[PDB]
Ligand binder design. Structure first.
Ligand code: HEM
Ligand code: HEM
Ligand SMILES: CNCCc1cccc(OCc2ccc3ccc(N)nc3c2)c1
Ligand SMILES: CNCCc1cccc(OCc2ccc3ccc(N)nc3c2)c1
Ligand SMILES: C[C@H](O)[C@H](O)[C@H]1CNc2nc(N)[nH]c(=O)c2N1
Ligand SMILES: C[C@H](O)[C@H](O)[C@H]1CNc2nc(N)[nH]c(=O)c2N1
Ligand SMILES: [Zn+2]
Lengths: 411, 407
């Protein structure tokens, strides 16, 4: 079966065959589309075809499908599974898997970069102190003095689900959020619940507006431990505006390195529950979502006031005007400090090129329109007019429940 | 089988049961989502009618009544006899309002029950259609105090006697391909602006020439009519601050009147059902003006603002996009023509969505279309999970008549 997607702006039509290699469920049916729903212990039974499917993929990619190397590897994995109930990936396979999980991430607009991923193998890690060391090294490597480099560090895979490695932080670097008795929030409201746990776990909170949260690290199913990232490793950028001098006095800054640390990496049926990865920011992530979401720092108004906008009627678009100036300031600040960032026009333009290349070289590119379109100025980016097909390929990044909701406490 | 949708800004959770009454197909499967794809007999008819009469009689608290059962037999008898059937006015109005209510892509559905339905099923000719369309336009326009309206022409019989309005909208600006290479007027209508000529129109080859109507009655060849200019309410576009904005020489019409959709009620097909409401500002300023394959004046506005158009990172496009949209809203509000901003309209829609979940058990919604084309995440709908499914009565797309007309 063939599927065609049309760019309504260029009339370019593409043909998808890759969706045939799709296994996992979308959430949708003939009768309902769940395309806007945010988030819609394995027996040897279902493990071998998963491993085999992965190894067939891997060996096809290295032009060795059906080789003796391929066949012996299937045999070895087969024997390891029935003997030990799981298996170990070679380094080559692990790197391939991690890159392809990113390549397959249908909500990621930054996928043009997928083949340049530095993969750090942390599978020999046994303790939280070990995890901290690996993560420090990741951050130092990734940050690279502002010249950001994509990287992923992969901790040991799940076994029985009782000895999981988990990074409890949703991102390696994030600001604390504190709920005040009067109902207001100090810092990042997105992090209030996590900040609380940290505090309960013995973190002494500075209680400022931009306190970098400690790492809360769980090795081998043991209770998580607190670690402070060395501040010299946390690259931060003071936000200023190129025309508005009062903007700096808002006292804003943001960290340079977006490093998502709560997702699960699935490769050949193996589950890596702690696999922090990082790239670099698209400006709107900070300027639109992190500062302007009503459920975040929500500074739209204070910016709007300082611009002396007509804030009486929404039809003055004061919210839209403030939003743009803030995003201008984020991009200005990062570029001025030589910290890698990409604006949404550049990023979506790149993604379109990537996508067309993928259709050609791969037979498709799974893409979630809902996430790919930037949170501002959607229709003046080329992705907006781009029809996209969403389907799930493995290897993949998956969500997993927050660890504090599932963790069995030792003491 | 009972579905929950979360709003991520408010944690408000809604439970949908209404999707269970869905009948048509989405284009999606368990293995692939097509959420971002724009366009995915005597025996067929009676269950379709039954289904409709069932919901109709339920809506008036007379499900399981003599009248219900009697109407059911009558329609059934009329079907087996005539191979189709006629709706009663009450049912027709009900069906039209519910087609709007069920339009998952429409952010303006909070207004769904205030729809003026104009029964034009007695119409036989293009001149007749023209008369009805002029009356619709005058009524809907209301000197700027816009009112929602639909005019419904005779239902399809056998696909040979189709009533069709060939325009995509009752009011749209001409577009001509220059010898220069680019495009004069509206690029979206170049192919239509041509068919008008190829049928006999005489373009003032201008930039904002109101297109003539091309009206097809009873399957016959379509005929050109000029909408009386005095019925076409237009708004000169100025900015409340950029005095140079006027010189760009832009205007737009007040009445968005979509005329190429097919209205399906109780199995019956109304191929000609032009309907109109009023604009959300972003439809004109974001899409009509700033789309690359439309008026595409972003660059020109940016220059007059003397923004740094050297690198995309200055966000000059975004900056200009906003000013343009401020001007549109300002221009309509000034001239006392109904318009709604995307903030108001999405806020209205969340409320409508709440109401529908309460009083109906759900509200089919297409996030891809509901979220406005600018500033999406600072509107409440961006953080709103939505379920998309097809309920009937409904508006459907239909092929362009020229591709299909048996001349
Ligand atoms: C290198 C530059 C990168 C850019 C500019 C970028 C950009 C983005 C953006 C803007 C999103 C949407 C996030 C949101 O709005 O919350 C996203 C999602 C995502 N990205 Fe990328 N990304 C980059 C690198 C990476 C890397 C290195 C990985 C993994 C190795 C990755 C994997 C993902 C995944 C799995 C999602 C979906 C998250 C979810 O489903 O919640 N990205 N990306
Ligand atoms: C009264 C004020 C109204 C507002 C503010 C409004 C708003 C909108 C907007 C912004 C869209 C997306 C259009 C686009 O971006 O191209 C839309 C779509 C739609 N509207 Fe409404 N609308 C209104 C009235 C109506 C009425 C009166 C009807 C029918 C009785 C209707 C039926 C539809 C349908 C069927 C679509 C989907 C069109 C498609 O699938 O291509 N709307 N609406
Ligand atoms: C603001 N939307 C957050 C919703 C959400 C929920 C769970 C995970 C999640 O990850 C977003 C995400 C993931 C990977 C990224 C990689 C690079 C980058 N610049 N942003 C990235 C952003 C995002
Ligand atoms: C710019 N998108 C155009 C795609 C498209 C194709 C076919 C029909 C169509 O209708 C949009 C539409 C329908 C009804 C409307 C009612 C009111 C309003 N302000 N806009 C409305 C807009 C829209
Ligand atoms: C490819 C994509 O489906 C297409 O550009 C859609 C996206 N969302 C839209 N949303 C609205 N409201 N109107 C549109 O015309 C479109 N076009
Ligand atoms: C309900 C909806 O799916 C949710 O708000 C999504 C919308 N699109 C998004 N798109 C991106 N890139 N990031 C997001 O967090 C979201 N949130
Ligand atoms: Zn879907």
């Amino acid at each position: 079966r063939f599927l065609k997607v049309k760019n309504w702006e260029t009339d370019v039509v593409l043909t998808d065959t890759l969706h045939l290699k799709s296994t996992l469920e979308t959430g949708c049916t003939e009768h309902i589309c769940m395309g806007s729903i945010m988030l819609p212990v394995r027996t040897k039974d279902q493990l071998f075809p998963l491993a085999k499917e992965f190894l067939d993929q891997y060996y096809s990619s290295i032009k060795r499908f059906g080789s003796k190397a391929h066949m012996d590897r299937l045999e070895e994995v087969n024997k390891e599974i029935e003997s030990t109930s799981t298996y170990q990936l070679k380094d080559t396979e692990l790197i391939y898997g991690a890159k392809h999980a990113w390549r397959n991430a249908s909500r990621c607009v930054g996928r043009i970069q997928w083949s340049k991923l530095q993969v750090f193998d942390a599978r020999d890690c046994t303790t939280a102190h070990g995890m901290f060391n690996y993560i420090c090294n990741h951050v130092k490597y990734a940050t690279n003095k502002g010249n950001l480099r994509s990287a992923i560090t992969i901790f040991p895979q799940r076994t029985d689900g009782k000895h999981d490695f988990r990074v409890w932080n949703s991102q390696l670097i994030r600001y604390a959020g504190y709920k005040q008795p009067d109902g207001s929030t100090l810092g990042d409201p997105a992090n209030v619940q996590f900040t609380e746990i940290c505090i309960q776990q013995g973190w002494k909170a500075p209680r400022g507006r931009f306190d970098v949260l400690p790492l809360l690290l769980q090795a081998n199913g043991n209770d998580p431990e607190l670690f402070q990232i060395p501040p010299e490793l946390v690259l931060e950028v003071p936000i200023r505006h190129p025309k508005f001098d009062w903007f700096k006095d808002l006292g804003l800054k943001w960290y340079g390195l977006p490093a998502v640390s709560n997702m699960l990496l699935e490769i050949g049926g193996l589950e890596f529950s702690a696999c922090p990865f990082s790239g670099w920011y698209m400006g709107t992530e900070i300027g639109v979502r992190d500062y302007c979401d009503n459920s975040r720092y929500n500074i739209l108004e204070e910016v709007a006031k300082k611009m002396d906008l007509d804030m009486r009627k929404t039809s003055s678009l004061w919210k839209d005007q403030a939003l743009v100036e803030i995003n201008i300031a984020v991009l200005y600040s990062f570029q001025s400090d030589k910290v890698t960032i990409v604006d949404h026009h550049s990023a979506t333009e790149s993604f379109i090129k990537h996508m067309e290349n993928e259709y050609r070289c791969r037979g498709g590119c799974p893409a979630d329109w809902v996430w790919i379109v930037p949170p501002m100025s959607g229709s003046i980016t080329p992705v907006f007019h781009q029809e996209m097909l969403n389907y799930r390929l493995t290897p993949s990044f998956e969500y997993q429940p927050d660890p504090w909701n599932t963790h069995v406490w030792k003491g």
